[PDB]
């Protein structure tokens, strides 16, 4: 209550004062700037004028020439002159030419793409570890290889040897795999890239291999990084025809997935994190340990772990003395954690239909009957074979 508001007012007396001070000293207080900043801005602007025509650099020559290609088309053999550094010149880069005699007046151009938008993430999850609590020691193997060599460089120099790489998450569904990943990217606060494995198969042919070579050049740049390939099982069935899938498209994705993660390339820091529920279809050139170190195995939790799990979800709901929290856990006999989460979303859906705004012992024992009927109606064994 008060804790939050003291700090929020403290950063709105910082933001206000700094903006008034920093605006006044660019428009009135000029002494280390003044003459010397008015001469440098005047020289660079006059010398190149405007309009400036953006080009794309195909190749450099080291005697200070370049072959640039306009994007319209007409090619040009331009000169590298004045107010330019050759440290940023290189293929693919965007340069400014003077619209009459085209000389490279400088490089400052980087123009964001809608193909680098889909890959990069803006998110900051609203859950952090210990909303996953339970299966406690399964996030305490992903913290030994993702978080821990960044935080303490000391311990991995003290033992020596190369540090771990990667992890695979596989196992029973309803064991939280998707939120486990969404928690190791929020703790560290490293640049978290995120791609589903089903975008790597597209109707277009051989477009697979170009897309994931792109993903890893973006990742190497922002390094240190975490790459989520969520659902790399999906590459096993999703296909649009038999050549947009089939041996053809599945081999192209392997080959690619193999180069990015270990090749001649001599990759910088990409940690990889994969979500999956198929281990017996993966490349045998990845579950080769020594790309991917400790793999994590997940199973349905047991009755005391499911007591820690039902306590995270039931504080959300309205609380009463009537509620029998311990007896929903007991009756369930190694049932997953995705059901426990479908039962507390079902308790406030029955509660709203009544228009009674208390969640009590009656609303939870009714919501368990609806959750056990969908999975049990789909069991058409009836009289046990």
């Amino acid at each position: 209550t008060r804790c939050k508001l003291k700090l929020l007012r403290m950063e709105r007396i910082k933001d206000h004062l700094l903006l008034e001070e920093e605006f006044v000293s660019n428009s009135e207080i000029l002494k280390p700037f003044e003459k010397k900043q008015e001469e440098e801005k005047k020289q660079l602007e006059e010398i190149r004028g405007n309009p400036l025509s953006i080009g794309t650099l195909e190749e450099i020559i080291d005697d200070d020439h370049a072959i640039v290609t306009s994007p319209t088309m007409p090619d040009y053999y331009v000169s590298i002159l004045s107010f330019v550094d050759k440290e940023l010149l290189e293929p693919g880069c965007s340069v400014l030419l003077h619209h009459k005699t085209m000389s490279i007046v400088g490089v400052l151009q980087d123009d964001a793409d809608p193909m680098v938008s889909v890959m990069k993430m803006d998110k900051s999850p609203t859950e952090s570890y210990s909303d996953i609590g339970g299966l406690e020691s399964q996030i305490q193997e992903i913290k030994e290889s993702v978080e821990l060599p960044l935080t303490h460089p000391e311990l991995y120099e003290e033992m020596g040897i190369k540090p771990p790489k990667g992890v695979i998450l596989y196992g029973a569904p309803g064991t939280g795999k998707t939120l486990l990943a969404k928690a190791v990217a929020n703790q560290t606060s490293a640049t978290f890239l995120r791609i589903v494995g089903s975008e790597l198969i597209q109707k277009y042919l051989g477009d697979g291999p170009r897309l994931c070579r792109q993903i890893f050049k973006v990742a190497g740049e922002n390094a240190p990084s975490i790459v989520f390939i969520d659902e790399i099982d999906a590459i096993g069935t999703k296909r649009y025809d038999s050549n947009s899938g089939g041996e053809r498209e599945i081999q192209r994705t392997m080959l690619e997935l193999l180069n990015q993660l270990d090749g001649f390339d001599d990759r910088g820091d990409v940690k990889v994190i994969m979500a999956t529920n198929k281990i017996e279809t993966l490349d045998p050139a990845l579950i080769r340990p020594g790309r991917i170190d400790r793999k994590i195995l997940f199973e349905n939790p047991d009755l005391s772990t499911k007591k820690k799990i039902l306590g995270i979800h039931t504080s959300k709901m309205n609380l009463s003395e009537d509620v029998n929290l311990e007896t929903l856990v007991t009756t369930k006999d190694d049932l997953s954690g995705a059901d426990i989460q479908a039962m507390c979303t079902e308790a406030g859906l029955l509660a709203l239909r009544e228009r009674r705004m208390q969640v009590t012992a009656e609303d939870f024992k009714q919501a368990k009957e609806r959750v056990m009927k969908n999975k049990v109606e789909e069991n058409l064994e009836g009289l046990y074979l």
Partner: protein
């Protein structure tokens, strides 16, 4: 449908005799109606499956009164129309 992804499932019934007569009534207002026309008698003759059927009988009757060169849509046109629409749907679904 991994457990906990879906919280509402809306099944859509084929049309009841109260559901078929309320869709038929909204379209009937553009047509002309002379006194004596019950829209409940037409709604019990049909059986429907869909809300495309219930609107296409009323649309078919505005085509018989056009051919006739009759401004008003009176009660012979909806006898012919129920006969064409039900006969058409038994001969494309067979």
């Amino acid at each position: 449908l991994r457990p906990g992804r879906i919280d509402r499932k809306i099944e859509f019934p084929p049309p009841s005799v109260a559901a078929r007569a309320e869709i038929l009534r909204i379209h009937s207002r553009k047509m002309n109606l002379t006194r004596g026309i019950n829209l409940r008698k037409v709604a019990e003759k049909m059986n429907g499956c869909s809300g495309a059927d219930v609107k296409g009988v009323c649309t078919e009757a505005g085509m018989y009164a056009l051919r006739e060169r009759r401004i008003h849509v009176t009660q012979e046109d909806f006898e012919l129309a129920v006969g064409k629409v039900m006969n058409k749907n038994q001969e494309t679904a067979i």
